[PDB]
Amino acid sequence: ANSITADEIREQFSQAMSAMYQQEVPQYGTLLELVADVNLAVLENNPQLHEKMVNADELARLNVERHGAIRVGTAQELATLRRMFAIMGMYPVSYYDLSQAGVPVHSTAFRPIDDASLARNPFRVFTSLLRLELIENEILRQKAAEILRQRDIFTPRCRQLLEEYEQQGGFNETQAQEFVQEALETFRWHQLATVDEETYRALHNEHRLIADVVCFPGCHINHLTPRTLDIDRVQSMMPECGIEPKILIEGPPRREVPILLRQTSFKALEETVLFAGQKQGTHTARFGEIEQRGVALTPKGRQLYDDLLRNAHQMHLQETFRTFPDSEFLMRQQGLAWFRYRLTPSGEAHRQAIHPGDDPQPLIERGWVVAQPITYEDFLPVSNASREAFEQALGCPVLDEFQLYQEAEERSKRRCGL
Numbered sequence: 001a002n003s004i005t006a007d008e009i010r011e012q013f014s015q016a017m018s019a020m021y022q023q024e025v026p027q028y029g030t031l032l033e034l035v036a037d038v039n040l041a042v043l044e045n046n047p048q049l050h051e052k053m054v055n056a057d058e059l060a061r062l063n064v065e066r067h068g069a070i071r072v073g074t075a076q077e078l079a080t081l082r083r084m085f086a087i088m089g090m091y092p093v094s095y096y097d098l099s100q101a102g103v104p105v106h107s108t109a110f111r112p113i114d115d116a117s118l119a120r121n122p123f124r125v126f127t128s129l130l131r132l133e134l135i136e137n138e139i140l141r142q143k144a145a146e147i148l149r150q151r152d153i154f155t156p157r158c159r160q161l162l163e164e165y166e167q168q169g170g171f172n173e174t175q176a177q178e179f180v181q182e183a184l185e186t187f188r189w190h191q192l193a194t195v196d197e198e199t200y201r202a203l204h205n206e207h208r209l210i211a212d213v214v215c216f217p218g219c220h221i222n223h224l225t226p227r228t229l230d231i232d233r234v235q236s237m238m239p240e241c242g243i244e245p246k247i248l249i250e251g252p253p254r255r256e257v258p259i260l261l262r263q264t265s266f267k268a269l270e271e272t273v274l275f276a277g278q279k280q281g282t283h284t285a286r287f288g289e290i291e292q293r294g295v296a297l298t299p300k301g302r303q304l305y306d307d308l309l310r311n312a313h314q315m316h317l318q319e320t321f322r323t324f325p326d327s328e329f330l331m332r333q334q335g336l337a338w339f340r341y342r343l344t345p346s347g348e349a350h351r352q353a354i355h356p357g358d359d360p361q362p363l364i365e366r367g368w369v370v371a372q373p374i375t376y377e378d379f380l381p382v383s384n385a386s387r388e389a390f391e392q393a394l395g396c397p398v399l400d401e402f403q404l405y406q407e408a409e410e411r412s413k414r415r416c417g418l
Protein backbone atom coordinates (compact mmCIF):
# COMPACT_ATOMS: atom_id res chain seq x y z
CA ALA A 1 0.00 0.00 0.00
CA ASN A 2 1.26 3.49 -0.80
CA SER A 3 2.12 5.60 2.19
CA ILE A 4 0.27 8.87 1.68
CA THR A 5 2.32 12.03 2.07
CA ALA A 6 1.68 14.88 4.52
CA ASP A 7 1.09 17.44 1.76
CA GLU A 8 -1.67 15.11 0.64
CA ILE A 9 -3.41 14.88 3.98
CA ARG A 10 -2.99 18.60 4.61
CA GLU A 11 -4.56 19.77 1.37
CA GLN A 12 -7.42 17.29 1.66
CA PHE A 13 -8.01 18.40 5.26
CA SER A 14 -7.90 22.08 4.35
CA GLN A 15 -10.46 21.52 1.64
CA ALA A 16 -12.73 19.31 3.77
CA MET A 17 -12.47 21.95 6.49
CA SER A 18 -13.40 24.63 3.96
CA ALA A 19 -16.43 22.77 2.66
CA MET A 20 -17.72 22.20 6.18
CA TYR A 21 -17.20 25.81 7.08
CA GLN A 22 -19.04 26.82 3.90
CA GLN A 23 -22.06 24.70 4.69
CA GLU A 24 -21.97 26.16 8.20
CA VAL A 25 -21.36 29.78 7.19
CA PRO A 26 -22.77 30.58 3.69
CA GLN A 27 -21.44 34.13 3.72
CA TYR A 28 -18.08 32.39 3.51
CA GLY A 29 -19.12 30.95 0.17
CA THR A 30 -19.91 34.42 -1.15
CA LEU A 31 -16.69 35.75 0.33
CA LEU A 32 -14.67 33.24 -1.69
CA GLU A 33 -16.28 34.31 -5.00
CA LEU A 34 -15.58 37.96 -4.24
CA VAL A 35 -11.91 37.23 -3.48
CA ALA A 36 -11.59 35.18 -6.67
CA ASP A 37 -13.01 38.02 -8.71
CA VAL A 38 -10.76 40.55 -7.08
CA ASN A 39 -7.66 38.39 -7.50
CA LEU A 40 -8.45 37.71 -11.13
CA ALA A 41 -8.96 41.41 -11.85
CA VAL A 42 -5.74 42.40 -10.06
CA LEU A 43 -3.90 39.95 -12.27
CA GLU A 44 -5.73 41.21 -15.37
CA ASN A 45 -4.88 44.83 -14.51
CA ASN A 46 -1.24 43.93 -13.83
CA PRO A 47 0.36 41.57 -16.38
CA GLN A 48 3.89 42.00 -15.05
CA LEU A 49 2.73 41.21 -11.53
CA HIS A 50 1.11 38.10 -13.01
CA GLU A 51 4.43 37.39 -14.76
CA LYS A 52 6.50 37.73 -11.59
CA MET A 53 4.14 35.39 -9.76
CA VAL A 54 4.06 32.69 -12.44
CA ASN A 55 7.87 32.71 -12.52
CA ALA A 56 7.95 32.03 -8.79
CA ASP A 57 5.40 29.19 -8.60
CA GLU A 58 3.32 31.33 -6.20
CA LEU A 59 0.13 31.69 -8.22
CA ALA A 60 -1.10 28.18 -7.66
CA ARG A 61 -1.07 28.41 -3.85
CA LEU A 62 -3.11 31.61 -4.06
CA ASN A 63 -6.19 29.55 -5.03
CA VAL A 64 -6.07 27.24 -2.02
CA GLU A 65 -4.56 29.40 0.73
CA ARG A 66 -6.46 29.64 4.02
CA HIS A 67 -5.68 29.73 7.71
CA GLY A 68 -7.82 28.46 10.53
CA ALA A 69 -8.19 29.80 14.04
CA ILE A 70 -8.93 27.50 16.97
CA ARG A 71 -8.97 27.69 20.75
CA VAL A 72 -8.37 25.07 23.39
CA GLY A 73 -8.38 25.05 27.16
CA THR A 74 -5.80 22.43 28.14
CA ALA A 75 -2.17 21.61 27.58
CA GLN A 76 -3.30 18.03 26.88
CA GLU A 77 -5.64 19.13 24.08
CA LEU A 78 -2.78 21.27 22.76
CA ALA A 79 -0.36 18.35 22.61
CA THR A 80 -2.75 16.11 20.70
CA LEU A 81 -3.17 18.88 18.11
CA ARG A 82 0.64 19.06 17.91
CA ARG A 83 0.53 15.37 17.00
CA MET A 84 -2.41 15.65 14.66
CA PHE A 85 -0.80 18.51 12.69
CA ALA A 86 2.59 16.81 12.50
CA ILE A 87 0.89 14.06 10.52
CA MET A 88 0.00 16.87 8.10
CA GLY A 89 3.42 18.47 7.80
CA MET A 90 2.61 21.45 9.99
CA TYR A 91 4.86 22.59 12.84
CA PRO A 92 4.31 25.08 15.68
CA VAL A 93 5.90 28.34 14.59
CA SER A 94 6.55 31.36 16.79
CA TYR A 95 4.79 32.47 19.97
CA TYR A 96 2.04 35.07 20.39
CA ASP A 97 1.09 36.38 23.83
CA LEU A 98 -2.40 37.81 23.28
CA SER A 99 -2.56 38.48 27.03
CA GLN A 100 -0.41 41.52 26.30
CA ALA A 101 -3.71 42.74 24.82
CA GLY A 102 -6.25 41.57 27.38
CA VAL A 103 -7.28 38.29 25.78
CA PRO A 104 -6.77 35.48 28.37
CA VAL A 105 -4.87 33.23 25.94
CA HIS A 106 -1.49 32.82 24.23
CA SER A 107 -0.58 30.94 21.07
CA THR A 108 1.39 29.59 18.13
CA ALA A 109 0.90 28.85 14.45
CA PHE A 110 1.07 25.32 13.08
CA ARG A 111 2.28 25.51 9.47
CA PRO A 112 4.53 23.88 6.84
CA ILE A 113 8.15 24.99 6.89
CA ASP A 114 9.73 23.63 3.73
CA ASP A 115 9.58 25.72 0.51
CA ALA A 116 7.80 23.05 -1.59
CA SER A 117 5.12 22.33 0.98
CA LEU A 118 4.33 26.02 1.30
CA ALA A 119 4.18 26.41 -2.48
CA ARG A 120 1.96 23.35 -2.87
CA ASN A 121 -0.53 24.16 -0.05
CA PRO A 122 0.21 26.57 2.84
CA PHE A 123 -2.56 25.64 5.26
CA ARG A 124 -2.11 27.21 8.68
CA VAL A 125 -4.05 27.03 11.94
CA PHE A 126 -3.52 29.74 14.53
CA THR A 127 -3.91 27.81 17.76
CA SER A 128 -4.66 29.52 21.04
CA LEU A 129 -4.34 28.12 24.52
CA LEU A 130 -6.55 29.46 27.32
CA ARG A 131 -4.74 30.74 30.42
CA LEU A 132 -7.09 30.11 33.33
CA GLU A 133 -4.90 32.01 35.81
CA LEU A 134 -5.94 35.16 33.95
CA ILE A 135 -9.56 34.68 34.95
CA GLU A 136 -10.43 37.18 37.69
CA ASN A 137 -13.39 35.58 39.41
CA GLU A 138 -11.85 32.56 41.13
CA ILE A 139 -15.18 30.74 41.37
CA LEU A 140 -15.41 30.85 37.60
CA ARG A 141 -11.77 29.94 37.07
CA GLN A 142 -12.66 26.95 39.20
CA LYS A 143 -15.68 25.89 37.18
CA ALA A 144 -13.94 26.53 33.85
CA ALA A 145 -11.09 24.31 34.99
CA GLU A 146 -13.47 21.56 36.12
CA ILE A 147 -15.35 21.43 32.82
CA LEU A 148 -12.14 21.46 30.81
CA ARG A 149 -10.44 18.56 32.59
CA GLN A 150 -13.51 16.34 32.52
CA ARG A 151 -14.11 16.78 28.78
CA ASP A 152 -12.74 15.17 25.63
CA ILE A 153 -12.69 16.86 22.21
CA PHE A 154 -11.18 14.12 20.03
CA THR A 155 -13.08 11.11 18.71
CA PRO A 156 -11.93 7.72 20.03
CA ARG A 157 -11.24 6.57 16.48
CA CYS A 158 -9.13 9.74 16.12
CA ARG A 159 -6.88 8.95 19.09
CA GLN A 160 -6.61 5.40 17.78
CA LEU A 161 -5.30 6.74 14.47
CA LEU A 162 -2.65 8.89 16.14
CA GLU A 163 -1.46 5.73 17.88
CA GLU A 164 -1.50 3.54 14.76
CA TYR A 165 0.39 6.35 13.05
CA GLU A 166 3.10 6.28 15.70
CA GLN A 167 3.51 2.52 15.30
CA GLN A 168 3.72 2.42 11.50
CA GLY A 169 5.27 5.87 11.28
CA GLY A 170 2.93 6.36 8.34
CA PHE A 171 -0.68 5.96 7.22
CA ASN A 172 -2.17 4.11 4.28
CA GLU A 173 -4.76 5.58 1.91
CA THR A 174 -7.69 4.07 3.71
CA GLN A 175 -6.49 5.42 7.08
CA ALA A 176 -5.52 8.79 5.60
CA GLN A 177 -9.10 9.34 4.48
CA GLU A 178 -10.54 8.20 7.81
CA PHE A 179 -8.11 10.38 9.72
CA VAL A 180 -9.27 13.40 7.72
CA GLN A 181 -12.90 12.72 8.51
CA GLU A 182 -12.46 11.91 12.20
CA ALA A 183 -10.26 14.94 12.80
CA LEU A 184 -12.73 17.14 10.95
CA GLU A 185 -15.24 16.16 13.64
CA THR A 186 -13.24 17.92 16.33
CA PHE A 187 -13.77 21.30 14.64
CA ARG A 188 -17.40 20.90 13.55
CA TRP A 189 -19.93 23.39 14.95
CA HIS A 190 -22.66 22.38 17.31
CA GLN A 191 -25.49 24.51 18.59
CA LEU A 192 -25.94 22.52 21.82
CA ALA A 193 -23.90 24.07 24.61
CA THR A 194 -22.35 21.58 27.00
CA VAL A 195 -23.50 23.56 30.05
CA ASP A 196 -26.65 25.00 31.59
CA GLU A 197 -27.71 28.53 30.65
CA GLU A 198 -26.90 29.89 34.09
CA THR A 199 -23.32 28.63 33.75
CA TYR A 200 -23.08 30.01 30.22
CA ARG A 201 -24.32 33.49 31.10
CA ALA A 202 -21.95 33.66 34.07
CA LEU A 203 -18.87 32.57 32.12
CA HIS A 204 -19.82 34.73 29.13
CA ASN A 205 -20.20 37.71 31.43
CA GLU A 206 -16.75 37.09 32.89
CA HIS A 207 -15.43 37.05 29.30
CA ARG A 208 -16.85 35.96 25.93
CA LEU A 209 -13.73 34.03 24.96
CA ILE A 210 -14.00 31.93 28.11
CA ALA A 211 -17.57 30.83 27.39
CA ASP A 212 -16.59 30.17 23.78
CA VAL A 213 -13.91 27.71 24.92
CA VAL A 214 -15.72 25.92 27.76
CA CYS A 215 -19.37 25.84 26.81
CA PHE A 216 -19.06 24.15 23.42
CA PRO A 217 -18.09 20.58 22.38
CA GLY A 218 -14.82 20.23 20.47
CA CYS A 219 -13.02 23.35 19.34
CA HIS A 220 -15.16 24.73 16.53
CA ILE A 221 -13.60 27.00 13.89
CA ASN A 222 -13.23 30.62 15.03
CA HIS A 223 -12.59 31.71 11.47
CA LEU A 224 -11.30 30.41 8.14
CA THR A 225 -9.33 33.03 6.24
CA PRO A 226 -8.80 32.97 2.41
CA ARG A 227 -6.07 35.13 0.85
CA THR A 228 -6.36 38.17 -1.44
CA LEU A 229 -4.01 40.27 -3.55
CA ASP A 230 -5.85 43.50 -2.55
CA ILE A 231 -7.60 43.87 0.79
CA ASP A 232 -8.95 47.41 0.14
CA ARG A 233 -10.75 46.41 -3.06
CA VAL A 234 -12.32 43.46 -1.27
CA GLN A 235 -13.32 45.73 1.58
CA SER A 236 -15.03 48.06 -0.95
CA MET A 237 -16.85 45.29 -2.85
CA MET A 238 -18.16 43.52 0.27
CA PRO A 239 -21.16 45.75 0.99
CA GLU A 240 -22.25 45.28 -2.60
CA CYS A 241 -22.20 41.55 -1.80
CA GLY A 242 -24.06 41.74 1.52
CA ILE A 243 -21.03 41.89 3.77
CA GLU A 244 -20.50 44.81 6.12
CA PRO A 245 -16.73 44.90 6.63
CA LYS A 246 -15.25 47.04 9.35
CA ILE A 247 -13.23 50.15 8.61
CA LEU A 248 -10.27 48.84 10.60
CA ILE A 249 -7.47 47.13 8.75
CA GLU A 250 -4.72 45.75 10.98
CA GLY A 251 -1.14 45.53 9.87
CA PRO A 252 0.84 48.23 8.09
CA PRO A 253 -0.85 50.70 5.71
CA ARG A 254 -1.25 50.23 1.94
CA ARG A 255 2.21 50.17 0.37
CA GLU A 256 3.77 49.61 -3.02
CA VAL A 257 5.63 46.69 -1.50
CA PRO A 258 3.42 45.04 1.15
CA ILE A 259 5.08 43.73 4.30
CA LEU A 260 3.91 41.07 6.72
CA LEU A 261 0.16 41.08 6.24
CA ARG A 262 -3.02 43.15 6.33
CA GLN A 263 -6.33 41.76 7.61
CA THR A 264 -9.88 42.76 8.49
CA SER A 265 -12.91 41.02 9.93
CA PHE A 266 -16.69 41.13 9.76
CA LYS A 267 -19.68 39.33 11.29
CA ALA A 268 -20.42 36.37 9.04
CA LEU A 269 -23.40 35.14 11.03
CA GLU A 270 -25.04 35.16 14.42
CA GLU A 271 -25.54 31.58 15.57
CA THR A 272 -28.13 30.21 17.94
CA VAL A 273 -26.91 28.68 21.18
CA LEU A 274 -29.08 25.93 22.64
CA PHE A 275 -29.25 24.33 26.09
CA ALA A 276 -30.24 20.74 26.79
CA GLY A 277 -33.58 20.43 28.50
CA GLN A 278 -35.01 23.86 27.57
CA LYS A 279 -36.58 25.97 24.82
CA GLN A 280 -34.91 29.28 25.57
CA GLY A 281 -31.48 29.69 24.07
CA THR A 282 -29.16 32.55 23.31
CA HIS A 283 -26.67 33.43 20.60
CA THR A 284 -23.12 34.08 19.62
CA ALA A 285 -21.28 35.65 16.71
CA ARG A 286 -19.14 33.88 14.10
CA PHE A 287 -16.72 36.41 12.58
CA GLY A 288 -15.28 36.15 9.11
CA GLU A 289 -11.79 37.35 8.24
CA ILE A 290 -9.83 38.20 5.07
CA GLU A 291 -6.10 38.88 4.60
CA GLN A 292 -3.44 40.04 2.15
CA ARG A 293 0.11 38.84 2.72
CA GLY A 294 3.34 40.62 1.82
CA VAL A 295 7.08 40.05 2.21
CA ALA A 296 8.60 38.47 5.34
CA LEU A 297 10.48 40.91 7.50
CA THR A 298 13.98 40.66 8.81
CA PRO A 299 14.59 41.04 12.58
CA LYS A 300 15.79 44.55 11.83
CA GLY A 301 12.69 45.33 9.79
CA ARG A 302 10.26 43.77 12.23
CA GLN A 303 11.84 45.99 14.84
CA LEU A 304 11.34 49.02 12.60
CA TYR A 305 7.75 48.00 12.08
CA ASP A 306 7.18 47.61 15.83
CA ASP A 307 8.80 50.98 16.62
CA LEU A 308 6.80 52.77 13.94
CA LEU A 309 3.62 51.25 15.36
CA ARG A 310 4.69 52.20 18.88
CA ASN A 311 4.74 55.74 17.52
CA ALA A 312 1.17 56.27 16.28
CA HIS A 313 -6.31 57.14 12.13
CA GLN A 314 -5.37 55.23 8.98
CA MET A 315 -4.04 58.52 7.61
CA HIS A 316 -1.75 59.00 10.62
CA LEU A 317 -0.48 55.45 10.18
CA GLN A 318 0.33 55.99 6.50
CA GLU A 319 2.01 59.25 7.52
CA THR A 320 4.16 57.45 10.07
CA PHE A 321 5.22 54.62 7.76
CA ARG A 322 6.68 56.87 5.09
CA THR A 323 9.72 56.00 7.17
CA PHE A 324 9.65 52.38 6.12
CA PRO A 325 11.26 52.13 2.63
CA ASP A 326 8.64 51.29 0.02
CA SER A 327 10.79 49.74 -2.72
CA GLU A 328 12.25 46.21 -2.80
CA PHE A 329 15.60 47.72 -3.76
CA LEU A 330 15.76 49.94 -0.68
CA MET A 331 14.42 47.28 1.64
CA ARG A 332 16.96 44.84 0.29
CA GLN A 333 19.78 47.36 0.63
CA GLN A 334 19.08 47.98 4.35
CA GLY A 335 18.50 44.33 5.19
CA LEU A 336 14.87 44.94 6.09
CA ALA A 337 13.27 41.99 4.34
CA TRP A 338 13.79 38.42 3.11
CA PHE A 339 14.43 37.71 -0.53
CA ARG A 340 14.89 34.52 -2.51
CA TYR A 341 17.71 35.11 -5.02
CA ARG A 342 17.32 33.14 -8.26
CA LEU A 343 19.60 33.02 -11.28
CA THR A 344 18.26 34.31 -14.55
CA PRO A 345 18.53 32.22 -17.74
CA SER A 346 21.14 34.79 -18.65
CA GLY A 347 22.50 34.40 -15.12
CA GLU A 348 22.85 30.62 -15.20
CA ALA A 349 24.69 31.08 -18.50
CA HIS A 350 27.22 33.28 -16.77
CA ARG A 351 26.96 31.15 -13.63
CA GLN A 352 30.75 30.74 -13.69
CA ALA A 353 31.19 34.48 -13.10
CA ILE A 354 29.12 34.59 -9.95
CA HIS A 355 31.16 33.88 -6.84
CA PRO A 356 30.46 33.48 -3.08
CA GLY A 357 30.39 36.76 -1.20
CA ASP A 358 29.49 38.85 -4.25
CA ASP A 359 27.16 41.83 -4.08
CA PRO A 360 23.82 40.94 -5.73
CA GLN A 361 22.98 44.53 -6.64
CA PRO A 362 25.33 44.61 -9.69
CA LEU A 363 24.19 41.18 -10.90
CA ILE A 364 20.57 42.23 -10.62
CA GLU A 365 21.09 45.39 -12.66
CA ARG A 366 23.07 43.29 -15.10
CA GLY A 367 20.02 41.10 -15.54
CA TRP A 368 21.66 37.96 -14.14
CA VAL A 369 19.98 37.84 -10.73
CA VAL A 370 16.45 38.45 -9.54
CA ALA A 371 15.43 39.02 -5.93
CA GLN A 372 12.07 37.34 -5.33
CA PRO A 373 10.39 38.45 -2.11
CA ILE A 374 9.67 35.67 0.39
CA THR A 375 6.03 35.59 1.42
CA TYR A 376 5.15 36.10 5.08
CA GLU A 377 3.78 32.82 6.39
CA ASP A 378 3.06 33.92 9.91
CA PHE A 379 1.01 36.51 11.81
CA LEU A 380 1.00 40.05 13.11
CA PRO A 381 2.93 40.60 16.32
CA VAL A 382 0.63 41.50 19.19
CA SER A 383 0.99 45.09 20.43
CA ASN A 384 9.07 34.53 29.18
CA ALA A 385 7.58 32.28 31.90
CA SER A 386 4.65 32.41 29.48
CA ARG A 387 6.55 31.17 26.44
CA GLU A 388 8.28 28.37 28.35
CA ALA A 389 4.98 27.52 30.02
CA PHE A 390 3.28 27.37 26.61
CA GLU A 391 6.19 25.37 25.26
CA GLN A 392 5.73 23.02 28.22
CA ALA A 393 2.05 22.57 27.38
CA LEU A 394 2.86 22.09 23.71
CA GLY A 395 5.50 19.45 24.38
CA CYS A 396 8.36 21.11 22.49
CA PRO A 397 9.76 24.56 21.79
CA VAL A 398 8.23 26.66 19.02
CA LEU A 399 10.32 27.29 15.91
CA ASP A 400 11.81 30.75 15.40
CA GLU A 401 10.25 32.07 12.18
CA PHE A 402 13.13 34.43 11.62
CA GLN A 403 15.51 31.45 11.50
CA LEU A 404 13.16 29.85 8.98
CA TYR A 405 13.14 32.73 6.47
CA GLN A 406 16.88 33.30 6.89
CA GLU A 407 17.69 29.70 6.03
CA ALA A 408 15.38 29.90 3.02
CA GLU A 409 17.16 33.07 1.84
CA GLU A 410 20.54 31.51 2.50
CA ARG A 411 19.49 28.35 0.74
CA SER A 412 18.79 30.40 -2.40
CA LYS A 413 22.12 32.23 -2.21
CA ARG A 414 23.94 28.90 -2.37
CA ARG A 415 21.76 27.81 -5.26
CA CYS A 416 22.96 31.01 -7.01
CA GLY A 417 26.66 30.96 -6.23
CA LEU A 418 26.75 32.89 -2.96
Ligand SMILES: [Zn+2]
Nearest residue numbers: 069126225289
Ligand atom coordinates in the same frame (compact mmCIF):
# COMPACT_ATOMS: atom_id res chain seq x y z
ZN1 LIG B 1 -6.81 34.87 11.94
